[PDB]
Amino acid sequence: QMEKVSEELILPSSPTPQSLKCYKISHLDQLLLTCHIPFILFYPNPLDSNLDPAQTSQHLKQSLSKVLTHFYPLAGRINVNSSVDCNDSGVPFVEARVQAQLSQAIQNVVELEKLDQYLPSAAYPGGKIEVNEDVPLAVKISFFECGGTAIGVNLSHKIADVLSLATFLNAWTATCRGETEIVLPNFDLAARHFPPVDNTPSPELVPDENVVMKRFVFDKEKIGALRAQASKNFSRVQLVVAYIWKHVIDVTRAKYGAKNKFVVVQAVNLRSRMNPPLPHYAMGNIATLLFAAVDAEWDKDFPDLIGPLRTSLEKTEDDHNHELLKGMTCLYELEPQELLSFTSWCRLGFYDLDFGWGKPLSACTTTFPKRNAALLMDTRSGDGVEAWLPMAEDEMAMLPVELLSLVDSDFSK
């Protein structure tokens, strides 16, 4: 049970010069949704400090304001498909009080959809409030009775991938700590290497109906089991993707008939795959789609899908435009149940984000309302992998026990 305290718009601490040049929209951005990337950190009550909500909010707001001088496009408004007006309209900053302790509130989140309340605005369609598609950035801080807090961020996907979210949060937290050495964003590179195309529509998101998301947790010991069953050098992600893919194939072939192929698609950072690479601090959607597939009759063991996936990660001799056309070519003559997808928030330093009073207890997100559109995240120990997997309720139910046992709803530990 929470109550809103206030909403304000945070401006950059010095106005954006009419001179300065706002973020130019790239081709890759044009192809993305106008939905937001919803991101949530829960912090315990600090052991060093004894700061008032008011004081904690002041540090946060002043430091946001300072850092928006470098991330000024984030205070503008998006002009969909083409550009961003750097008009310093400001970032919505929401403050709430929740009548409960942190641990009590997040130790048994049965419906992950209820994490919505920690977001400052809608990320996706289908709630009571419409998405504000023009707003690049909004934030919310919720204060618990214990001293614990939650910071929710909605960053527009038309203007950022999760690497760009991380560039932003590293800068914001670091500014809040009062450091002089921030890693500065680069806003120019994206449209240089991927120039936009005129009249390109942004795709609309139509939510699917019977979808729930659960967080399936694979800890060090579980990965070890997978690693060991697979015996070659197997990384954490390959093992987990393979394992889930095997089990969603079984559900798909049992509910629906087996038809054409089964595909899995991973969205990974394109910066490090360029020849030569782009820096991690280039802002914008700079990501690519890597495909793996097995035909309809497949039915083998989960280590058998790893080949397909490893082969999938190979950087190719083919240019971006071709990679994209292949991608779209396969995606469109696929029936909706034949696609499984994974985006990764892996290895982005989210559990190191320290505003000045400690590192997170948990990082979460909200329900992307489409079947089989999953999300891989780090675990607080750097061991293990969290899979945030949305599915049709009836389909999730058909998963085997060895998988469904991994569902974890305690975010307090």
UniProtKB/Swiss-Prot annotation:
**What is the name listed in the Swiss-Prot or TrEMBL entry for this protein?**
Vinorine synthase
Known outcome of mutating H157A:
Total loss of activity
Pfam families to which the protein is assigned, alphabetical: Transferase
Its source organism is: Rauvolfia serpentina
Q: State the family it belongs to.
A: Belongs to the plant acyltransferase family.
So what does mutating D354A actually do? 65% reduction of activity
Residue ranges the record marks as coiled coil: none
Q: Name one GO molecular function term.
A: vinorine synthase activity
Q: Which gene is the coding source of this polypeptide chain? A: ACT
Q: What is this protein for, i.e. what is its function?
A: Acetyltransferase involved in the biosynthesis of ajmaline-type monoterpenoid indole alkaloids (MIAs) natural products, important plant-derived pharmaceuticals used in the therapy of heart disorders. Catalyzes the conversion of 16-epivellosimine to vinorine, precursor of vomilenine, an intermediate chemical in the biosynthesis of ajmaline. Acts on gardneral, but not on polyneuridine aldehyde or N-methylgardneral.
**The UniProt record lists the keyword RNA-binding:** no
What keywords are annotated for this sequence in UniProt?
Acyltransferase, Alkaloid metabolism, Transferase
E.C. designation(s): 2.3.1.160
What's a BP term from Gene Ontology annotated to this protein?
Answer: alkaloid metabolic process
State the tissue distribution.
Mainly expressed in roots and, to a lower level, in leaves.
Its UniProt pathway annotation is: Alkaloid biosynthesis; ajmaline biosynthesis
Q: Which reaction does it catalyse?
A: 16-epivellosimine + acetyl-CoA = vinorine + CoA
pH dependence as annotated: Optimum pH is 7.8.
Superkingdom of origin: Eukaryota
Q: What biotechnological purpose does this protein serve?
A: The strictosidine aglycone-producing AJM7-DeltaHYS yeast strain expressing pathway genes of the VOM module, RsGS, SBE (GsSBE, RsSBE1 or RsSBE2), RsPNAE, RsVS and RsVH, accumulates vomilenine. Additionnal expression of pathway genes of the AJM module, RsVR, RsDHVR, AAE (RsAAE1 or RsAAE2) and RsNNMT, leads to the production of ajmaline. Ajmaline is an anti-arrhythmic alkaloid commercially used as an efficient drug for the treatment of arrhythmic heart disorder.
Q: Changing S13A: reported impact?
A: 29% reduction of activity
Q: Tell me what the record says about temperature and activity.
A: Optimum temperature is 35 degrees Celsius.
Annotated catalytic residues: H157, D354
Assembly with partners or alone: Monomer.
